[PDB]
Design a protein around this motif. Structure first.
Motif, PDB file in Angstrom:
ATOM      1  N   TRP A 163       0.812  -1.213   0.000  1.00  0.00           N
ATOM      2  CA  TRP A 163       0.000   0.000   0.000  1.00  0.00           C
ATOM      3  C   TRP A 163       0.851   1.271   0.000  1.00  0.00           C
ATOM      4  CZ3 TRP A 163      -4.695  -0.222  -1.735  1.00  0.00           C
ATOM      5  CH2 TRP A 163      -5.492  -1.364  -1.535  1.00  0.00           C
ATOM      6  N   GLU A 164       2.022   1.244   0.639  1.00  0.00           N
ATOM      7  CA  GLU A 164       2.923   2.394   0.711  1.00  0.00           C
ATOM      8  C   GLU A 164       3.472   2.770  -0.674  1.00  0.00           C
ATOM      9  OE1 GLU A 164       6.623   4.065   3.495  1.00  0.00           O
ATOM     10  OE2 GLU A 164       6.130   1.908   3.535  1.00  0.00           O
ATOM     11  N   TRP A 165       4.013   1.804  -1.424  1.00  0.00           N
ATOM     12  CA  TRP A 165       4.522   2.096  -2.766  1.00  0.00           C
ATOM     13  C   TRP A 165       3.403   2.247  -3.805  1.00  0.00           C
ATOM     14  CZ3 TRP A 165       3.397  -0.976  -6.897  1.00  0.00           C
ATOM     15  CH2 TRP A 165       3.191  -2.352  -6.714  1.00  0.00           C
ATOM     16  N   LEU A 166       2.251   1.587  -3.646  1.00  0.00           N
ATOM     17  CA  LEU A 166       1.094   1.803  -4.524  1.00  0.00           C
ATOM     18  C   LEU A 166       0.553   3.230  -4.391  1.00  0.00           C
ATOM     19  CD1 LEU A 166      -0.720  -1.627  -4.174  1.00  0.00           C
ATOM     20  CD2 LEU A 166       0.086  -0.672  -6.302  1.00  0.00           C
ATOM     21  N   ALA A 167       0.455   3.759  -3.169  1.00  0.00           N
ATOM     22  CA  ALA A 167       0.031   5.138  -2.921  1.00  0.00           C
ATOM     23  C   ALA A 167       1.007   6.180  -3.496  1.00  0.00           C
ATOM     24  CB  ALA A 167      -0.129   5.327  -1.408  1.00  0.00           C
ATOM     25  N   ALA A 168       2.296   5.842  -3.593  1.00  0.00           N
ATOM     26  CA  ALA A 168       3.309   6.719  -4.172  1.00  0.00           C
ATOM     27  C   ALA A 168       3.214   6.845  -5.707  1.00  0.00           C
ATOM     28  CB  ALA A 168       4.683   6.223  -3.720  1.00  0.00           C
ATOM     29  N   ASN A 169       2.436   5.981  -6.368  1.00  0.00           N
ATOM     30  CA  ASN A 169       2.152   6.052  -7.798  1.00  0.00           C
ATOM     31  C   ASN A 169       0.723   6.574  -8.026  1.00  0.00           C
ATOM     32  OD1 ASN A 169       4.768   4.760  -8.928  1.00  0.00           O
ATOM     33  ND2 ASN A 169       4.126   3.295  -7.447  1.00  0.00           N
ATOM     34  N   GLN A 170       0.559   7.476  -8.990  1.00  0.00           N
ATOM     35  CA  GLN A 170      -0.693   8.033  -9.481  1.00  0.00           C
ATOM     36  C   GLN A 170      -1.571   6.954 -10.127  1.00  0.00           C
ATOM     37  OE1 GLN A 170       0.522  11.362 -12.012  1.00  0.00           O
ATOM     38  NE2 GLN A 170       1.089  12.611 -10.325  1.00  0.00           N
ATOM     39  N   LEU A 171      -2.262   6.198  -9.285  1.00  0.00           N
ATOM     40  CA  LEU A 171      -3.544   5.617  -9.641  1.00  0.00           C
ATOM     41  C   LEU A 171      -4.569   6.759  -9.630  1.00  0.00           C
ATOM     42  CD1 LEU A 171      -3.164   2.314  -7.615  1.00  0.00           C
ATOM     43  CD2 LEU A 171      -3.525   2.432 -10.066  1.00  0.00           C
ATOM     44  N   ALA A 172      -4.902   7.300 -10.805  1.00  0.00           N
ATOM     45  CA  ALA A 172      -5.882   8.387 -10.943  1.00  0.00           C
ATOM     46  C   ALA A 172      -7.286   8.036 -10.390  1.00  0.00           C
ATOM     47  CB  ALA A 172      -5.941   8.802 -12.420  1.00  0.00           C
ATOM     48  N   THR A 173      -7.525   6.774 -10.022  1.00  0.00           N
ATOM     49  CA  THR A 173      -8.813   6.263  -9.549  1.00  0.00           C
ATOM     50  C   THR A 173      -8.636   5.206  -8.455  1.00  0.00           C
ATOM     51  OG1 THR A 173      -8.882   4.725 -11.416  1.00  0.00           O
ATOM     52  CG2 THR A 173     -10.035   6.770 -11.748  1.00  0.00           C
ATOM     53  N   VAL A 174      -8.040   5.558  -7.308  1.00  0.00           N
ATOM     54  CA  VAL A 174      -8.140   4.715  -6.104  1.00  0.00           C
ATOM     55  C   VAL A 174      -9.486   4.989  -5.432  1.00  0.00           C
ATOM     56  CG1 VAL A 174      -7.044   3.872  -3.980  1.00  0.00           C
ATOM     57  CG2 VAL A 174      -5.620   4.701  -5.804  1.00  0.00           C
ATOM     58  N   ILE A 175     -10.515   4.224  -5.802  1.00  0.00           N
ATOM     59  CA  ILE A 175     -11.673   4.029  -4.927  1.00  0.00           C
ATOM     60  C   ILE A 175     -11.268   2.886  -4.002  1.00  0.00           C
ATOM     61  CG2 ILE A 175     -14.153   3.588  -4.728  1.00  0.00           C
ATOM     62  CD1 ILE A 175     -14.489   4.558  -7.633  1.00  0.00           C
ATOM     63  N   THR A 176     -10.920   3.196  -2.754  1.00  0.00           N
ATOM     64  CA  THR A 176     -10.681   2.203  -1.699  1.00  0.00           C
ATOM     65  C   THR A 176     -11.990   1.493  -1.334  1.00  0.00           C
ATOM     66  OG1 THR A 176     -10.702   4.048  -0.119  1.00  0.00           O
ATOM     67  CG2 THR A 176      -8.575   3.235  -0.669  1.00  0.00           C
ATOM     68  N   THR A 177     -12.509   0.652  -2.226  1.00  0.00           N
ATOM     69  CA  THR A 177     -13.538  -0.319  -1.850  1.00  0.00           C
ATOM     70  C   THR A 177     -12.882  -1.371  -0.963  1.00  0.00           C
ATOM     71  OG1 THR A 177     -13.242  -1.521  -3.946  1.00  0.00           O
ATOM     72  CG2 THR A 177     -15.012   0.042  -3.879  1.00  0.00           C
ATOM     73  N   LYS A 178     -13.504  -1.735   0.165  1.00  0.00           N
ATOM     74  CA  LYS A 178     -12.989  -2.704   1.162  1.00  0.00           C
ATOM     75  C   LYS A 178     -12.702  -4.127   0.624  1.00  0.00           C
ATOM     76  CE  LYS A 178     -14.721  -0.649   5.495  1.00  0.00           C
ATOM     77  NZ  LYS A 178     -15.552  -0.907   6.699  1.00  0.00           N
ATOM     78  N   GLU A 179     -12.811  -4.360  -0.679  1.00  0.00           N
ATOM     79  CA  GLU A 179     -12.761  -5.681  -1.314  1.00  0.00           C
ATOM     80  C   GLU A 179     -11.567  -5.882  -2.265  1.00  0.00           C
ATOM     81  OE1 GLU A 179     -17.591  -6.554  -1.001  1.00  0.00           O
ATOM     82  OE2 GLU A 179     -16.684  -6.294  -3.004  1.00  0.00           O
ATOM     83  N   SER A 180     -10.768  -4.852  -2.573  1.00  0.00           N
ATOM     84  CA  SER A 180      -9.599  -5.003  -3.454  1.00  0.00           C
ATOM     85  C   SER A 180      -8.331  -5.314  -2.660  1.00  0.00           C
ATOM     86  CB  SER A 180      -9.401  -3.758  -4.322  1.00  0.00           C
ATOM     87  OG  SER A 180      -9.346  -2.603  -3.508  1.00  0.00           O
ATOM     88  N   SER A 181      -7.654  -6.415  -2.991  1.00  0.00           N
ATOM     89  CA  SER A 181      -6.338  -6.723  -2.428  1.00  0.00           C
ATOM     90  C   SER A 181      -5.258  -5.809  -3.029  1.00  0.00           C
ATOM     91  CB  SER A 181      -6.008  -8.209  -2.631  1.00  0.00           C
ATOM     92  OG  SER A 181      -5.704  -8.496  -3.980  1.00  0.00           O
ATOM     93  N   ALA A 182      -4.137  -5.615  -2.323  1.00  0.00           N
ATOM     94  CA  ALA A 182      -2.996  -4.854  -2.851  1.00  0.00           C
ATOM     95  C   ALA A 182      -2.466  -5.443  -4.177  1.00  0.00           C
ATOM     96  CB  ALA A 182      -1.897  -4.828  -1.782  1.00  0.00           C
ATOM     97  N   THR A 183      -2.602  -6.758  -4.361  1.00  0.00           N
ATOM     98  CA  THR A 183      -2.230  -7.469  -5.590  1.00  0.00           C
ATOM     99  C   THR A 183      -3.111  -7.053  -6.770  1.00  0.00           C
ATOM    100  OG1 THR A 183      -1.870  -9.339  -4.086  1.00  0.00           O
ATOM    101  CG2 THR A 183      -1.470  -9.765  -6.369  1.00  0.00           C
ATOM    102  N   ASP A 184      -4.420  -6.875  -6.555  1.00  0.00           N
ATOM    103  CA  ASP A 184      -5.352  -6.451  -7.609  1.00  0.00           C
ATOM    104  C   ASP A 184      -5.055  -5.024  -8.074  1.00  0.00           C
ATOM    105  OD1 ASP A 184      -6.931  -8.874  -7.516  1.00  0.00           O
ATOM    106  OD2 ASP A 184      -7.757  -8.089  -5.604  1.00  0.00           O
ATOM    107  N   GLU A 185      -4.736  -4.127  -7.139  1.00  0.00           N
ATOM    108  CA  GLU A 185      -4.357  -2.754  -7.475  1.00  0.00           C
ATOM    109  C   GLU A 185      -2.998  -2.673  -8.181  1.00  0.00           C
ATOM    110  OE1 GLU A 185      -7.922  -0.862  -6.771  1.00  0.00           O
ATOM    111  OE2 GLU A 185      -6.127  -0.328  -7.886  1.00  0.00           O
ATOM    112  N   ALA A 186      -2.033  -3.517  -7.810  1.00  0.00           N
ATOM    113  CA  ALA A 186      -0.764  -3.617  -8.530  1.00  0.00           C
ATOM    114  C   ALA A 186      -0.958  -4.070  -9.993  1.00  0.00           C
ATOM    115  CB  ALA A 186       0.162  -4.558  -7.753  1.00  0.00           C
TER     116      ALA A 186
END
Lengths: 109, 322, 205, 335
Positions: free
Chosen positions: C30-53
């Motif tokens: 989550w620390e390095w994912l937040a450091a990259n511009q995902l222009a659409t982080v909707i933190t839905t309680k159901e996405s793993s850090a692997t799915d966002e990567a």
């Protein structure tokens, strides 16, 4: 309860009260989405946003928030400033709504 | 005493379908004249044509309303092999275009190879999904990923029925204990084909609809099918319009924990068979509670059917047009 | 003006380590994912850090299209080097771009079953079933452009499936592949004969 | 991979009982010592680095789990099989890999979990223990298997283990560890007197882990029926239910635990150093921890059993501890 024609906001609020007294959360959500969509279709973004927040629908809130932003880009000002100023903890519902709220805080400052 | 009311539909050819909105204040009609019309009920209880437009390049077979949570959305399907989605733009068109202009065609679904015989929106808890069935023996399920952009519809599922499809019904059950289900009817006239009603269940493990059941007792051409609304029943009810009216109950057999990917098996009973039309039955429709069935047939009548407290179905009313 | 190849290899390596990593690797992600511009982080309680990567990887492939399949090749070659099953979305995108390079990648990593399924689907696509999934504009007809058939890679697959005479499964795959190749060669012969007939109708216009 | 491919080409097809073939081209002792050193280095790296463990296991070209499990089916020396099982145990420390290893262990039948009616000659670890390790008087493979099971139980417990092949659950592994390993460990010959205790420690660690995380649920006291190949069979009970049932009755397992505590205190009363003292002390500690977990869970287990329709009787552990010790012929277990 879901089939009641919601022609007015008063009638909708009455139906909601009845649903809330009986803990019918799905119907509450559905009625709020219907009103939010109806308001949205009638280009009343403030009311649409209010109903979306009540529905606790993050996706819908994000959508309405994007429309506020688009309107700003076109007109240079927000149509419903009072509602956005009083979002409180509702701002956390979606990232886009949070942005919209903080952006407004910027203009206030 | 039921009062029949004639509505001058002003269609230039045969009307194939009539669909009410969720509130029963609006109706849509579709015809061989290639048009869809929308009618609004005034406070005095009169019906007025509020929109009329050409939708297709052939006979329009079915028209359906979406759930009002997705706005004012219509779908139509046609002999031209297409289904079309229409949205009503509720806005101040300046007081001079009250005739035809507030319905916008958002998309045309063109994947079907032959006539698209029926079109049904899914239950709202599944999102903005649209099933189409075609005489090519395929059911296609589309999803609008964005309700604010009804121009985009993604093909999610293709179901091969291996029979000419005539009608479709979503199981409206919101119970998380029941996987999403679709019934599909066939108008195939071949007497050698038994089982003209097929039930498909969505299998989460395979992310595909799998054939759960085939109603082998239904050998006659199927003109319409309807799942009854499930208000807390532990079983499903399916109406089938054919040479007679048939009502089936479908009780899910408890998944023995040993079939790690099977479709739900059903204990299926024919609870009613009614020949009282003495002719083909064209349409079947449940009331909102799933307790009263309406049927129409070549006898020029609409019949009402209801079970008593002993599950004995009876004809409770006959409506005839003058 | 540097090559983005090292960025895609490193992101693929982080996605692999996340998929193999316990709860601690998901927390650090989550620390390095937040450091990259995902222009659409909707933190839905159901996405793993692997799915966002993986969503980040898809967004970079969409933003940064190379003229040559280099970035998709580099990611696939990296995933296969770690023995990780390829995501269906990546397979389907690469099938539409270069199915012949994909077949060579499966052969390079001894994935004989997936290589045989890819050849069966590619032959079905040439025969006209699912041609859209492979970017093939027109199926095998007398008037269609010649699609390059990776015959040498398919013959290496047939050899690699044939070297293991003990595996009844590889023989069942090889017989299924041969029967499909024969169906293709028969339809190719017919389309070539119908092209010869189209060329042999005399110019009376 | 080259050793896996070469050793698999030489597996005799079952139909030719008549001709003396020349001796198997076995792995040379220097190649064996090399493979063991490589596996031990691999184990040590993946034991400490989770990122190395995931990256090696997911490597599409090497398929290490498939190759290692395939080599366990070959006729290789028991020392190499023991190091291969330790490498699988070190991979099984990550929960993602452990779940895949459970499915792969059931598919490979390294332990026979499916008994077909007609084969009187079992293939697998139970025969290697009874015919190979028992003749060598050394048990490295059995300990490495107990270590693999101990690590897999700690990282992932699959409820649907063996679903579709047999009745789901852990019971075939529990039967092997209980009846074939633990109940027989005393009757075996040992070249190293300390290894007797290393085998007892390794099995008791698994039993302790299985009972530690088990909480009695009402569902454990109801016979669940599962359809297998058109017959209804009763599902296997959770391993902690089975352990509680054997510890709360006059079972050979309880008697073996109590007699291990008696043997432990009798050796400690000598005040002399002896080979494997540390392993005997740990094996006794796991017996204490098992009895203590039993006493803590006993009241809840007996109340749910009394509420259930099961025709099972269970005795309070405290009353079984007043039983006559078969060795002393006195009620001296509490003493």
């Amino acid at each position: 309860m879901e089939r009641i024609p919601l022609s007015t906001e008063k009638k909708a609020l009455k139906a909601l009260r009845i649903c809330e007294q009986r803990q019918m959360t799905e119907q509450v959500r559905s009625i709020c989405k219907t009103m939010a969509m109806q308001s949205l279709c009638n280009r009343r973004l403030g009311s649409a946003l209010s109903w979306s927040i009540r529905a606790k629908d993050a996706a819908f809130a994000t959508l309405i928030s994007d429309r506020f932003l688009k309107e700003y880009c076109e007109r240079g000002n927000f149509t419903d400033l009072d509602l956005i100023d009083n979002l409180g903890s509702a701002m956390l519902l979606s990232d886009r709504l949070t942005f919209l709220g903080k952006y407004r805080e910027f203009h206030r400052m | 005493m039921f009062v029949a009311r004639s509505i001058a539909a002003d269609h230039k050819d045969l009307i194939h379908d009539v669909s009410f909105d969720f509130h029963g204040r609006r109706m849509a009609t579709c015809s061989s004249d290639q048009s869809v019309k929308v009618w609004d009920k005034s406070e005095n209880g009169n019906w007025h044509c509020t929109a009329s437009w050409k939708t297709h390049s052939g006979s329009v077979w079915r028209v359906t309303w979406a759930h009002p949570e997705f706005g004012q959305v219509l779908a139509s399907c046609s002999f031209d092999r297409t289904a079309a989605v229409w949205e009503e733009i509720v806005g101040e068109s300046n007081d001079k275009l009250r005739g035809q202009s507030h319905w916008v065609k958002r998309t045309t679904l063109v994947d079907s190879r032959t006539s698209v015989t029926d079109v049904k929106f899914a239950p709202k808890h599944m999102g903005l999904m649209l099933a189409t069935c075609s005489a090519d023996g395929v059911v296609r399920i589309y999803e609008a990923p964005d309700v604010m952009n009804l121009s985009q519809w993604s093909l999610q599922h293709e179901i091969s029925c291996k029979l000419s499809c005539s009608c479709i019904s979503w199981n409206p059950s919101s119970s998380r204990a029941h996987s999403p289900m679709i019934a599909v009817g066939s108008d195939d006239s071949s007497p050698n084909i038994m089982g003209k009603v097929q039930i498909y269940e969505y299998n989460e493990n395979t992310r595909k609809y799998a054939k759960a059941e085939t109603l082998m007792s239904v050998s006659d051409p199927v003109h319409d099918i309807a799942f009854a609304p499930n208000l807390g029943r532990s079983f499903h009810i399916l109406a089938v319009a054919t040479k007679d009216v048939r009502i089936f109950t479908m009780k899910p057999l408890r998944k023995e924990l040993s079939s790690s990917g099977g479709v739900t098996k059903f204990e299926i009973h024919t609870v009613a068979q009614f020949d009282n039309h003495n002719s083909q039955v064209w349409r079947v429709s449940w009331n909102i509670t799933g307790t009263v069935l309406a049927s129409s047939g070549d006898d020029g009548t609409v019949r009402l059917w209801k079970a008593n407290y002993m599950d004995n179905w009876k004809c409770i009313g006959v409506l005839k047009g003058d | 003006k540097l090559a983005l190849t090292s960025v895609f290899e490193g992101l693929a390596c982080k996605c692999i380590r996340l998929q193999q990593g316990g709860e601690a690797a998901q927390a650090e992600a989550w620390e390095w994912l937040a450091a990259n511009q995902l222009a659409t982080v909707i933190t839905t309680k159901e996405s793993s850090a692997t799915d966002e990567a993986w969503r980040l990887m898809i967004s970079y492939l969409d933003k940064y299209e190379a003229k040559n399949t280099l970035y998709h090749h580099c990611i696939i070659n990296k995933l296969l080097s770690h023995g990780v099953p390829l995501p269906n979305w990546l397979i389907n995108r690469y099938k539409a771009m270069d199915a012949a390079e994909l077949l060579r990648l499966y052969l390079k990593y001894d994935l004989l079953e997936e290589a045989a399924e890819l050849v069966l689907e590619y032959v079905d696509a040439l025969l006209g079933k699912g041609h859209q999934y492979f970017g093939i504009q027109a199926p095998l007809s007398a008037t269609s452009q010649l699609v390059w058939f990776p015959y040498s890679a398919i013959d290496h697959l047939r050899q690699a499936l044939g070297e293991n005479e003990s595996n009844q499964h590889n023989q069942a795959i090889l017989s299924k592949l041969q029967r499909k190749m024969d169906e293709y060669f028969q339809k190719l012969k017919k389309a070539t004969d119908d092209y010869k007939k189209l060329v042999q109708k005399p110019l009376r216009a | 991979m080259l050793y896996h491919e070469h050793l698999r080409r030489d597996l005799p097809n079952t139909d030719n009982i008549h001709q003396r073939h020349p001796p198997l081209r076995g792995i040379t002792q220097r190649e064996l010592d090399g493979l063991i050193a490589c596996l031990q280095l691999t184990c040590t790296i993946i034991d400490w680095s989770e990122s190395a463990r995931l990256a090696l296991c997911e490597h599409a070209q090497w398929m290490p789990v498939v190759v290692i499990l395939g080599l366990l089916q070959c006729s290789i020396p028991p020392l190499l099989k023991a190091e291969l099982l330790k490498t699988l145990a070190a991979f099984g420390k990550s929960p993602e890999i452990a779940a895949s290893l459970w499915q792969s262990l059931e598919y490979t039948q390294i332990l026979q979990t499916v008994r077909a009616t007609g084969l009187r000659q079992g293939v697998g670890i139970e025969v290697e223990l009874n015919e190979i390790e028992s003749r060598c008087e050394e048990y490295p493979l059995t300990r490495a298997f107990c270590q693999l099971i101990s690590t897999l139980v700690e990282s992932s417990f699959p409820t649907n283990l063996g679903a579709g092949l047999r009745a789901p659950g852990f019971e075939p592994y529990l039967q092997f560890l209980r009846d074939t390993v633990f109940l027989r460990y005393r009757t075996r010959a040992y070249r190293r007197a300390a290894e007797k205790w290393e085998v007892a420690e390794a099995v008791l660690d698994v039993f302790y882990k299985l009972l530690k995380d088990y909480e009695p649920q009402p569902e454990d006291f109801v016979d669940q029926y599962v359809e297998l190949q058109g017959e209804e069979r009763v599902a296997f009970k959770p391993p902690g239910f089975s352990l509680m049932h054997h510890l709360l009755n006059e079972s050979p397992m309880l008697e073996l635990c109590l007699s291990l505590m008696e043997e432990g205190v009798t050796q400690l009363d000598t005040y002399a150093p002896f080979p494997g003292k540390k392993h005997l002390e740990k094996a006794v500690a796991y017996c204490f921890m098992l009895l203590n977990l039993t006493l803590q869970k006993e009241n809840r287990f007996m109340d749910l059993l009394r509420e259930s329709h099961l025709s099972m009787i269970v005795t309070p552990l405290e009353q079984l501890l007043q039983g006559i010790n078969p060795r002393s012929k006195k009620a001296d277990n509490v003493v």
